[PDB]
Write an enzyme that holds these catalytic residues in place. Structure first.
Site, PDB file in Angstrom:
ATOM      1  N   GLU A  41      -5.196  -3.596   1.109  1.00 10.93           N
ATOM      2  CA  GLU A  41      -4.706  -4.991   0.966  1.00 10.93           C
ATOM      3  C   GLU A  41      -4.371  -5.257  -0.506  1.00 10.93           C
ATOM      4  OE1 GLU A  41      -4.016  -6.366   4.068  1.00 10.93           O
ATOM      5  OE2 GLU A  41      -2.683  -7.304   2.496  1.00 10.93           O
TER       6      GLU A  41
HETATM    7  C1  LIG Z   1      -8.681  -6.916   6.729  1.00  8.15           C
HETATM    8  C2  LIG Z   1      -8.701  -5.429   6.472  1.00  8.15           C
HETATM    9  C3  LIG Z   1      -7.605  -4.943   5.561  1.00  8.15           C
HETATM   10  C4  LIG Z   1      -6.755  -3.843   6.144  1.00  8.15           C
HETATM   11  C5  LIG Z   1      -5.320  -3.875   5.698  1.00  8.15           C
HETATM   12  C6  LIG Z   1      -4.880  -2.649   4.920  1.00  8.15           C
HETATM   13  C7  LIG Z   1      -3.778  -2.923   3.950  1.00  8.15           C
HETATM   14  C8  LIG Z   1      -2.435  -3.148   4.581  1.00  8.15           C
HETATM   15  O1  LIG Z   1      -2.273  -3.632   5.671  1.00  8.15           O
HETATM   16  S1  LIG Z   1      -1.103  -2.627   3.565  1.00  8.15           S
HETATM   17  C9  LIG Z   1      -1.329  -3.696   2.124  1.00  8.15           C
HETATM   18  C10 LIG Z   1       0.012  -4.226   1.699  1.00  8.15           C
HETATM   19  N1  LIG Z   1       0.309  -3.897   0.315  1.00  8.15           N
HETATM   20  C11 LIG Z   1      -0.211  -4.575  -0.707  1.00  8.15           C
HETATM   21  O2  LIG Z   1      -0.786  -5.648  -0.549  1.00  8.15           O
HETATM   22  C12 LIG Z   1      -0.064  -3.959  -2.080  1.00  8.15           C
HETATM   23  C13 LIG Z   1       1.166  -3.094  -2.147  1.00  8.15           C
HETATM   24  N2  LIG Z   1       2.386  -3.884  -2.182  1.00  8.15           N
HETATM   25  C14 LIG Z   1       2.643  -4.763  -3.138  1.00  8.15           C
HETATM   26  O3  LIG Z   1       2.007  -5.804  -3.279  1.00  8.15           O
HETATM   27  C15 LIG Z   1       3.781  -4.436  -4.087  1.00  8.15           C
HETATM   28  O4  LIG Z   1       3.448  -4.852  -5.400  1.00  8.15           O
HETATM   29  C16 LIG Z   1       5.117  -5.035  -3.627  1.00  8.15           C
HETATM   30  C17 LIG Z   1       5.621  -4.275  -2.398  1.00  8.15           C
HETATM   31  C18 LIG Z   1       4.924  -6.505  -3.243  1.00  8.15           C
HETATM   32  C19 LIG Z   1       6.170  -4.946  -4.724  1.00  8.15           C
HETATM   33  O5  LIG Z   1       7.397  -5.518  -4.204  1.00  8.15           O
HETATM   34  P1  LIG Z   1       8.437  -6.186  -5.219  1.00  8.15           P
HETATM   35  O6  LIG Z   1       9.744  -6.326  -4.519  1.00  8.15           O
HETATM   36  O7  LIG Z   1       8.375  -5.432  -6.506  1.00  8.15           O
HETATM   37  O8  LIG Z   1       7.789  -7.636  -5.428  1.00  8.15           O
HETATM   38  P2  LIG Z   1       8.324  -8.957  -6.154  1.00  8.15           P
HETATM   39  O9  LIG Z   1       9.719  -8.709  -6.617  1.00  8.15           O
HETATM   40  O10 LIG Z   1       7.311  -9.418  -7.145  1.00  8.15           O
HETATM   41  O11 LIG Z   1       8.353  -9.972  -4.921  1.00  8.15           O
HETATM   42  C20 LIG Z   1       9.259  -9.684  -3.836  1.00  8.15           C
HETATM   43  C21 LIG Z   1       9.120 -10.762  -2.792  1.00  8.15           C
HETATM   44  O12 LIG Z   1       7.877 -10.556  -2.074  1.00  8.15           O
HETATM   45  C22 LIG Z   1       7.215 -11.784  -1.880  1.00  8.15           C
HETATM   46  N3  LIG Z   1       5.979 -11.757  -2.644  1.00  8.15           N
HETATM   47  C23 LIG Z   1       5.625 -10.888  -3.643  1.00  8.15           C
HETATM   48  N4  LIG Z   1       4.425 -11.127  -4.117  1.00  8.15           N
HETATM   49  C24 LIG Z   1       3.967 -12.213  -3.382  1.00  8.15           C
HETATM   50  C25 LIG Z   1       2.763 -12.940  -3.404  1.00  8.15           C
HETATM   51  N5  LIG Z   1       1.753 -12.671  -4.224  1.00  8.15           N
HETATM   52  N6  LIG Z   1       2.638 -13.966  -2.529  1.00  8.15           N
HETATM   53  C26 LIG Z   1       3.658 -14.230  -1.701  1.00  8.15           C
HETATM   54  N7  LIG Z   1       4.833 -13.616  -1.591  1.00  8.15           N
HETATM   55  C27 LIG Z   1       4.921 -12.605  -2.470  1.00  8.15           C
HETATM   56  C28 LIG Z   1       8.186 -12.885  -2.298  1.00  8.15           C
HETATM   57  O13 LIG Z   1       8.939 -13.319  -1.187  1.00  8.15           O
HETATM   58  C29 LIG Z   1       9.035 -12.176  -3.350  1.00  8.15           C
HETATM   59  O14 LIG Z   1      10.332 -12.759  -3.420  1.00  8.15           O
HETATM   60  P3  LIG Z   1      10.704 -13.207  -4.922  1.00  8.15           P
HETATM   61  O15 LIG Z   1      10.828 -11.945  -5.745  1.00  8.15           O
HETATM   62  O16 LIG Z   1      12.019 -13.950  -4.824  1.00  8.15           O
HETATM   63  O17 LIG Z   1       9.583 -14.098  -5.410  1.00  8.15           O
HETATM   64  C1  LIG Z   2      -9.041   2.706   5.603  1.00  5.86           C
HETATM   65  C2  LIG Z   2      -7.618   2.291   5.333  1.00  5.86           C
HETATM   66  C3  LIG Z   2      -6.999   1.384   6.157  1.00  5.86           C
HETATM   67  C4  LIG Z   2      -5.666   0.998   5.946  1.00  5.86           C
HETATM   68  N1  LIG Z   2      -5.091   0.123   6.828  1.00  5.86           N
HETATM   69  C5  LIG Z   2      -3.830  -0.172   6.642  1.00  5.86           C
HETATM   70  C6  LIG Z   2      -3.186  -1.002   7.570  1.00  5.86           C
HETATM   71  O1  LIG Z   2      -3.748  -1.445   8.557  1.00  5.86           O
HETATM   72  N2  LIG Z   2      -1.854  -1.254   7.381  1.00  5.86           N
HETATM   73  C7  LIG Z   2      -1.174  -0.761   6.320  1.00  5.86           C
HETATM   74  O2  LIG Z   2       0.008  -1.063   6.225  1.00  5.86           O
HETATM   75  N3  LIG Z   2      -1.767  -0.010   5.379  1.00  5.86           N
HETATM   76  C8  LIG Z   2      -3.030   0.304   5.546  1.00  5.86           C
HETATM   77  N4  LIG Z   2      -3.658   1.125   4.638  1.00  5.86           N
HETATM   78  C9  LIG Z   2      -2.917   1.646   3.479  1.00  5.86           C
HETATM   79  C10 LIG Z   2      -3.372   0.950   2.200  1.00  5.86           C
HETATM   80  O3  LIG Z   2      -2.906  -0.392   2.172  1.00  5.86           O
HETATM   81  C11 LIG Z   2      -2.895   1.696   0.952  1.00  5.86           C
HETATM   82  O4  LIG Z   2      -3.742   2.806   0.747  1.00  5.86           O
HETATM   83  C12 LIG Z   2      -2.899   0.867  -0.332  1.00  5.86           C
HETATM   84  O5  LIG Z   2      -1.842  -0.092  -0.287  1.00  5.86           O
HETATM   85  C13 LIG Z   2      -2.743   1.728  -1.562  1.00  5.86           C
HETATM   86  O6  LIG Z   2      -1.579   2.581  -1.399  1.00  5.86           O
HETATM   87  P1  LIG Z   2      -1.715   4.162  -1.592  1.00  5.86           P
HETATM   88  O7  LIG Z   2      -2.993   4.636  -1.000  1.00  5.86           O
HETATM   89  O8  LIG Z   2      -0.441   4.770  -1.125  1.00  5.86           O
HETATM   90  O9  LIG Z   2      -1.797   4.283  -3.179  1.00  5.86           O
HETATM   91  P2  LIG Z   2      -0.652   4.113  -4.273  1.00  5.86           P
HETATM   92  O10 LIG Z   2       0.160   2.922  -3.906  1.00  5.86           O
HETATM   93  O11 LIG Z   2       0.035   5.419  -4.445  1.00  5.86           O
HETATM   94  O12 LIG Z   2      -1.517   3.789  -5.572  1.00  5.86           O
HETATM   95  C14 LIG Z   2      -2.240   4.862  -6.209  1.00  5.86           C
HETATM   96  C15 LIG Z   2      -2.784   4.371  -7.525  1.00  5.86           C
HETATM   97  O13 LIG Z   2      -1.676   3.962  -8.368  1.00  5.86           O
HETATM   98  C16 LIG Z   2      -1.883   2.643  -8.808  1.00  5.86           C
HETATM   99  N5  LIG Z   2      -0.597   2.004  -8.963  1.00  5.86           N
HETATM  100  C17 LIG Z   2       0.508   2.126  -8.168  1.00  5.86           C
HETATM  101  N6  LIG Z   2       1.518   1.408  -8.596  1.00  5.86           N
HETATM  102  C18 LIG Z   2       1.042   0.776  -9.736  1.00  5.86           C
HETATM  103  C19 LIG Z   2       1.626  -0.121 -10.647  1.00  5.86           C
HETATM  104  N7  LIG Z   2       2.876  -0.563 -10.554  1.00  5.86           N
HETATM  105  N8  LIG Z   2       0.857  -0.550 -11.673  1.00  5.86           N
HETATM  106  C20 LIG Z   2      -0.402  -0.106 -11.764  1.00  5.86           C
HETATM  107  N9  LIG Z   2      -1.053   0.737 -10.971  1.00  5.86           N
HETATM  108  C21 LIG Z   2      -0.264   1.142  -9.968  1.00  5.86           C
HETATM  109  C22 LIG Z   2      -2.763   1.999  -7.747  1.00  5.86           C
HETATM  110  O14 LIG Z   2      -3.406   0.845  -8.236  1.00  5.86           O
HETATM  111  C23 LIG Z   2      -3.717   3.156  -7.456  1.00  5.86           C
HETATM  112  O15 LIG Z   2      -4.732   3.247  -8.445  1.00  5.86           O
HETATM  113  C24 LIG Z   2      -4.977   1.514   4.834  1.00  5.86           C
HETATM  114  C25 LIG Z   2      -5.637   2.398   3.972  1.00  5.86           C
HETATM  115  C26 LIG Z   2      -6.916   2.815   4.224  1.00  5.86           C
HETATM  116  C27 LIG Z   2      -7.574   3.796   3.289  1.00  5.86           C
END
Ligand SMILES: CCCCCCCC(=O)SCCNC(=O)CCNC(=O)[C@H](O)C(C)(C)COP(=O)(O)OP(=O)(O)OC[C@H]1O[C@@H](n2cnc3c(N)ncnc32)[C@H](O)[C@@H]1OP(=O)(O)O
Ligand SMILES: Cc1cc2nc3c(=O)[nH]c(=O)nc-3n(C[C@H](O)[C@H](O)[C@H](O)COP(=O)(O)OP(=O)(O)OC[C@H]3O[C@@H](n4cnc5c(N)ncnc54)[C@H](O)[C@@H]3O)c2cc1C
Ligand SMILES: CCCCCCCC(=O)SCCNC(=O)CCNC(=O)[C@H](O)C(C)(C)COP(=O)(O)OP(=O)(O)OC[C@H]1O[C@@H](n2cnc3c(N)ncnc32)[C@H](O)[C@@H]1OP(=O)(O)O
Ligand SMILES: Cc1cc2nc3c(=O)[nH]c(=O)nc-3n(C[C@H](O)[C@H](O)[C@H](O)COP(=O)(O)OP(=O)(O)OC[C@H]3O[C@@H](n4cnc5c(N)ncnc54)[C@H](O)[C@@H]3O)c2cc1C
Lengths: 599, 600
Positions: free
Chosen positions: A439
């Site tokens: 997340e």
């Molecule tokens: C409950 C148990 C948990 C299990 C869940 C496991 C995890 C998952 O499901 S996957 C997690 C999803 N990934 C993450 O949260 C972290 C990785 N992704 C990121 O956050 C990246 O930094 C990422 C993809 C947003 C970068 O995208 P990028 O295009 O560079 O972002 P940015 O240009 O700043 O924003 C793009 C758009 O996204 C949206 N957005 C970005 N950040 C935010 C924010 N903090 N809040 C709301 N909208 C946002 C907006 O619509 C924004 O449009 P605008 O640029 O006009 O404001």
């Molecule tokens: C148990 C588990 C459950 C999950 N469940 C889901 C799910 O339900 N749905 C889903 O979509 N995903 C899910 N994920 C994926 C999870 O969200 C990702 O692992 C997480 O977003 C991190 O991405 P990554 O592992 O590819 O690491 P990367 O994105 O490759 O990051 C690796 C390292 O680089 C750093 N890094 C990367 N970019 C930057 C930057 N610009 N500046 C500074 N540091 C940076 C990170 O902070 C980290 O230390 C799950 C993962 C796990 C382990």
């Protein structure tokens, strides 16, 4: 055995943050009477203590079992889920419109606090679902809501978020799963998504994947990403699991912890999906699903500190080892309880300061979420929305980081015994570790807070919060009971803004500074938030004690925890300040090829 | 990338920073530790670590150990590996020539241990615990006892345990109740249950030699009543080989967070035959040759965890492409930039690097003292080295384990989600690491030992050995341009260290709770201060090698950059520890025990 912190949940909601007034001031909360809230908390507490808490060890030992046909969950998981369904918990915080009870999100969050503490791996099944609803609710067509949301609100169907691929996790712009549009206006999704929490399991009648994919000639990066509904079973004529879609689980992960939550490789072989929201605006739409789970993951951080404290306090009063430094305190026993040792108290008070501190911050944030979902006043929605955008990343990264520290104190208090499976303290640490990776990683959250939210609003995002702190130090400056809290709080409130300005200045000369300061800044922000919440719990504690109270010990404990927080924990700010003012050069000067020349 | 021994850094630390060639020539019995022999043993050591045990670390963690009534099975490959290690002569390396040994210095044997624990800690505990019980037989055993037990342990044919802990007692050994009944023939019969015995039962050797803490029948109460007993699994026969099965059995092994490959045994002694070693009621005194070895040995575990997190993280940081540099794409020909372009990933890398390389320097500094205590015939030097070890031993064990756990967690953080997955090995590093702060003396207990037993009991004298060395360094380099920037804060901190000691002392005069209240903060401060000296000294050496011209400029430039990172981003943690330890004990002792949990 898990015991819900109901007296502390009531302290925070009712006494500190005026949740009765808040509910009275707010459309939909006429059915959320104090007596009804209390009965829903007490019902929630009972389910958590009696049904899912006893499955927590089972879930860790068994984990889930993959076969080609699907995924078995640990013994007792699905039968607890049927009971969760039959109690109508899934429908609590959803529109009366789509089959829900319409009670506020913030009352939902109190139930999630107790579910996460009792069994996090089990709680993720309902937890993820709760988000896909918030996605369908905000961006789905009326027909998508009628088919998909009604089933998720009832809990008969579960929901996932399918972003991650092998090559991309933070960098979603690099995603490569394809949506190919079909004559009938639906799509065939081809791709492999990994780490999909609750992707395949035996808990429900259907699973609704909210999948990020790209349309065949979309732009590059985030601006080429679209959101798709891909259900495991396509609906039939009555809206029930129908035809089996070409979505399957090729495997589950062997992981350090959260074993009871299936973590799935999901293969989409030209599976039928439906676009939700505008073409190529998928990232924008997915961020409803994400900011739910940001605060939902901040909740994980709170749960690991709370479980670590429950175990620690019990063992520290039962384990006899060595004697007090000021003479034997239990001379009628062969040793003193380990609570008499100053270091055991330091470890207990650390967990207590983090659990109770983060509980305050979490239900403060939850009031903002209610306002954004229900207020009519656009001044009040917009101020709530800017506050959520500031607190969401702080809560997620800071509460998980200190939750994991808190979990480790729990283990340390047990000594050697803490390393042994049967006491559950080591499982707590293992389950805590993912909370700083998923997340949005600690590092990505920090970058979001400092660069996108604070520096991109030229400091305005901070001002909402530093305003409330400045008003507290003014109203309480001449309050004798919290003199000692207000002085350093006023000083830190100033420095917070000064640092924000110095970092913007450094960043103007060298962009590497936003990254160099980011986690140090987010952690400082976290201690500063909790300095305010502890100064305010101390103020309330002193108010009650001066007016006479049935619960002297309850409020004296709040003053004693606040003083521990300020004198022993908040000074960690000094190291965050020094590190962040040190500049990007001490990180960036070393060449990549020169990091490992000692081999 | 699989485990790679950091030999170049081990040589930098011993040969270049710590003068190990000159040190070995100044020591009796060290004539066979020629520079070329040490380098040969170091190479063969790394080969064994990288090729035989490092591949078994994942298998150890997946299988762990299998209990049955008859015995305890070890992970696949472990015992065969233990055979090749016995065939290599490694157990005999740093032991006396007359008892089967090669007679090389303990500080050479420690370099091998550094590489073993990094390759597979669980496997290394088997010989590493033997290494302890040998030191105890050497110090306190009768010449007969050394003939029977020490010879078999030095060959590696027999392994050795330390048997202290019982269900009610780990730190409070005074409460132990395992009994030893005198027999007519001058042997004893040990009856009691010991828990958490590492290597208590396994299938790797021909015999196991238990060194057991037990009470004689009318002994005084507390630690004054503890005696030390040799209790072998198989009683020796006339030849000196495994004979009669003693009444020593393993009733179970624990299910643990980590170090699955090291069997953690409930040992039932059912009037087993034992032999008193050392004076009666002086068990705890004798058992402390075994415990301090195993404390500098556990500090090494902390170094190991930081090392493994660093090796995983640097490789992944250079291969994983995610996002782009904040100053424009650095690898525009690729779809994303290596994550090493991101400042926060460099911060986690350099944290692990500062801790691994700083702790390696501290470790071999300490090991030179071990060597002087064991071999020097000058009394003034033996006394000062003994006193320096007394100060550093608990700082090394507590500090290096704690920052070792942090460093292992940075490793996982660099891999993101992928770091939580078993396949990469980073999460095992964290789970193996966690025990290191609990066993061989808890962080809290080592902190009380440092402040209460050594520092305040000597009214601050125990600190002087080290502050003296630091003060001479700051004078010797006040004018030195290349390190002036380290010297200034080091001299400010060295002075503060002495002031803090006195203030904690003043505070303890008024309130004895202050010793426990300041203890862990004081040990962590002391840890950071030790590394501030070692990074300043390594920065001085690197300046001197670069001014003179070297074919390895980058290697020495990297030491300066790491030292600057340590000083600017890590050393400031001392600020938090100073404020906490000067805050007073009342913020910890005022809350009544019944008022800690009133939120339920
Ligand atoms: C409950 C148990 C948990 C299990 C869940 C496991 C995890 C998952 O499901 S996957 C997690 C999803 N990934 C993450 O949260 C972290 C990785 N992704 C990121 O956050 C990246 O930094 C990422 C993809 C947003 C970068 O995208 P990028 O295009 O560079 O972002 P940015 O240009 O700043 O924003 C793009 C758009 O996204 C949206 N957005 C970005 N950040 C935010 C924010 N903090 N809040 C709301 N909208 C946002 C907006 O619509 C924004 O449009 P605008 O640029 O006009 O404001
Ligand atoms: C148990 C588990 C459950 C999950 N469940 C889901 C799910 O339900 N749905 C889903 O979509 N995903 C899910 N994920 C994926 C999870 O969200 C990702 O692992 C997480 O977003 C991190 O991405 P990554 O592992 O590819 O690491 P990367 O994105 O490759 O990051 C690796 C390292 O680089 C750093 N890094 C990367 N970019 C930057 C930057 N610009 N500046 C500074 N540091 C940076 C990170 O902070 C980290 O230390 C799950 C993962 C796990 C382990
Ligand atoms: C490599 C493989 C690693 C695997 C690790 C697994 C092995 C283990 O975990 S077994 C080790 C676990 N056991 C412990 O560490 C027990 C914890 N220790 C303690 O709390 C104390 O040191 C304890 C209980 C032994 C002493 O308690 P107490 O009697 O109150 O101490 P104290 O009165 O100050 O000293 C008692 C005597 O012990 C000795 N002693 C105490 N501290 C030390 C020390 N730091 N160094 C040397 N000797 C010491 C002295 O002989 C002292 O007598 P005197 O004071 O006259 O010199
Ligand atoms: C994997 C493993 C392997 C082990 N191997 C061995 C072995 O081979 N041989 C062996 O003999 N033992 C072994 N042990 C036992 C181990 O050394 C003990 O766990 C350790 O000594 C701590 O004892 P305890 O767990 O009973 O904790 P306790 O002594 O009960 O301590 C509990 C808590 O109280 C704190 N505490 C206690 N007294 C004080 C005080 N005076 N001041 C401040 N804080 C205090 C401790 O720091 C800790 O936080 C092993 C343990 C484990 C887990």
């Amino acid at each position: 055995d898990y015991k819900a912190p109901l007296r502390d949940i009531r302290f925070v909601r009712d006494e500190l943050l005026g949740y009765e007034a808040h509910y009275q001031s707010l459309p939909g909360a006429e059915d959320a009477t104090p007596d009804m809230v209390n009965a829903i908390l007490e019902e929630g507490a009972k389910f958590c203590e009696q049904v899912i808490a006893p499955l927590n060890r089972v879930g860790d030992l068994e984990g889930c079992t993959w076969s080609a046909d699907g995924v078995k969950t640990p013994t007792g998981f699905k039968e607890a889920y049927q009971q969760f369904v039959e109690g109508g918990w899934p429908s609590l915080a959803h529109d009366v419109e789509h089959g829900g009870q319409g009670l506020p999100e913030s009352l939902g969050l109190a139930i999630s606090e107790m579910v996460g503490q009792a069994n996090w791996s089990w709680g993720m099944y309902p937890g993820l679902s709760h988000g896909a609803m918030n996605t369908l609710h905000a961006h789905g067509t009326a027909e998508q809501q009628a088919t998909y949301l009604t089933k998720l609100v009832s809990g008969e169907w579960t929901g996932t978020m399918c972003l991650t691929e092998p090559h991309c996790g933070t960098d979603l712009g690099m995603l490569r799963t394809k949506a190919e549009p079909q004559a009938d206006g639906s799509y065939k999704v081809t791709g492999t998504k990994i780490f999909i929490s609750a992707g395949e399991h035996d808990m429900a009648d259907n699973i609704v994947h909210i999948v990020l994919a790209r349309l065949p000639d979309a732009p590059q990066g985030t601006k080429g990403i679209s959101l798709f509904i891909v259900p495991k079973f396509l609906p039939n004529a009555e809206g029930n699991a129908g035809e089996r879609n070409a979505v399957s689980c090729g495997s589950i992960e062997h992981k350090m912890g959260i074993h009871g939550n299936a973590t799935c490789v999901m293969n989409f072989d030209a599976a039928t999906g439906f676009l939700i929201g505008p073409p190529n605006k998928g990232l924008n739409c997915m961020f409803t699903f994400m900011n739910t789970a940001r605060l939902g993951t901040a909740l994980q951080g709170l749960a690991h500190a709370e479980v670590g404290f429950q175990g620690g306090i019990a063992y520290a009063r039962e384990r006899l080892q060595m004697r007090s430094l000021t003479g034997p305190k239990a001379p009628e026993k062969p040793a003193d309880p380990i609570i008499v040792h100053p270091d055991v108290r330091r470890m207990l008070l650390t967990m207590k300061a983090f659990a109770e501190g983060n509980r305050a911050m979490l239900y403060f944030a939850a009031k903002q979420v209610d306002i954004v979902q229900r207020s009519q006043d656009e001044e009040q929605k917009k101020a709530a929305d800017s506050m959520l955008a500031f607190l969401t990343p702080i809560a997620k990264a800071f509460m998980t980081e200190v939750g994991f520290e808190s979990a480790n104190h729990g283990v340390q208090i047990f000594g050697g015994h803490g390393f042994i499976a049967e006491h559950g303290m080591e499982q707590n640490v293992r389950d805590s570790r993912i909370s700083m990776l998923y997340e949005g990683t600690t590092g990505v959250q920090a970058l979001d807070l400092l660069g996108r939210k604070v520096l991109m609003t030229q400091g305005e995002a901070l001002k909402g919060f530093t305003k409330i702190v400045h008003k507290f130090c003014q109203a309480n400056e001449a309050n004798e009971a919290v003199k000692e809290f207000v002085a350093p709080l006023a000083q830190l409130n100033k420095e917070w803004g000064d640092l924000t300005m110095k970092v913007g200045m450094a960043a103007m000369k060298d962009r590497e500074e936003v990254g160099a300061a980011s986690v140090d800044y987010l952690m400082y922000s976290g201690y500063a938030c909790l300095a305010y919440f502890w100064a305010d719990m101390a103020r309330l504690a002193a108010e009650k004690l001066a007016a006479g109270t049935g619960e002297e010990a309850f409020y004296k404990a709040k003053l004693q925890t606040a003083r521990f927080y300020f004198q022993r924990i908040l000074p960690r700010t000094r190291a965050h300040v020094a590190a962040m003012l040190s500049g990007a050069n001490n990180l960036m000067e070393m060449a990549e090829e020169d990091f490992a020349l000692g081999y």
